[PDB]
Design a protein around this ligand. Structure first.
Ligand SMILES: *[C@@H]1O[C@H](CO)[C@@H](O[C@@H]2O[C@H](CO)[C@@H](O)[C@H](O)[C@H]2NC(C)=O)[C@H](O)[C@H]1NC(C)=O
Ligand code: NAG
Lengths: 77, 49, 49
């Protein structure tokens, strides 16, 4: 168990659903040649050599699950 | 107690159905006996234990 | 982004999907992105509006 400060009154503020606006296409497939999102070996390292390695990796060029968040409703200030 | 039967519910997306099980017990002696399991790992990180 | 991790899923009191059970891993960035708060603890729903 640990220290956690307790909360206040439990009137959760109003929450909307506007996924239709959220539906936007910014697909960024991953490039293995560009070497992005590539795990390192867990305990070892090399230098200036090419080596085959078996492990955990993503598939080449997936569209993925791009989600975003944004600001809420605002009327001036 | 021995012969106890336990169960719980499952969410619909995980295939439905009810998870069921049965358990058994062994009584104590005067002195308590316990079990230990050792496993060592080599290449997970820096060799440091 | 803020993450939730768990091995037990379910629907809420009104049947809305997103209810989890037992211990749950919570990831929350804070401090304007500088802090990476995280805990594997128990989340309990509130019964308000
Ligand atoms: C890393 O290794 C490569 C080859 O394994 C080295 O590339 C060679 O460099 C010499 C000297 O510049 C060239 O004559 C060869 O033609 C290169 N071979 C290639 C490009 O296949 C490279 O020099 C090494 N890096 C360091 C810093 O030593
Ligand atoms: C922030 O939350 C953590 C965990 O609940 C707690 O240990 C800490 O005291 C809190 N800090 C403040 C300033 O409330």
């Amino acid at each position: 168990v640990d220290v956690g400060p307790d909360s206040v009154k439990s009137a959760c503020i109003e929450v909307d659903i506007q996924q239709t606006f959220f539906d936007k296409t910014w697909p960024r497939p991953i490039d293995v040649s560009k070497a992005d999102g590539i795990i390192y070996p867990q305990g070892r390292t090399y230098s200036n050599i090419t080596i085959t390695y078996q492990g955990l990796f993503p598939y080449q060029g997936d569209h993925g699950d791009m989600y975003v968040y944004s600001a809420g409703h605002a009327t001036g200030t | 107690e021995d012969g106890d039967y336990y169960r719980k519910q499952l969410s619909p997306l995980e295939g439905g159905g009810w998870l069921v099980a049965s358990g058994s017990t062994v009584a104590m002696t005067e002195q308590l006996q316990m079990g230990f399991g050792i496993t060592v790992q080599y290449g997970t990180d820096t060799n440091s234990v | 982004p803020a993450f939730m991790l768990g091995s037990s899923v379910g629907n809420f009191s009104d049947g809305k999907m997103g209810r989890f059970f037992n211990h749950t891993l919570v990831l929350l960035p804070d401090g304007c992105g500088t802090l990476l708060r995280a805990f594997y603890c128990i989340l309990e729903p509130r019964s308000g509006n």
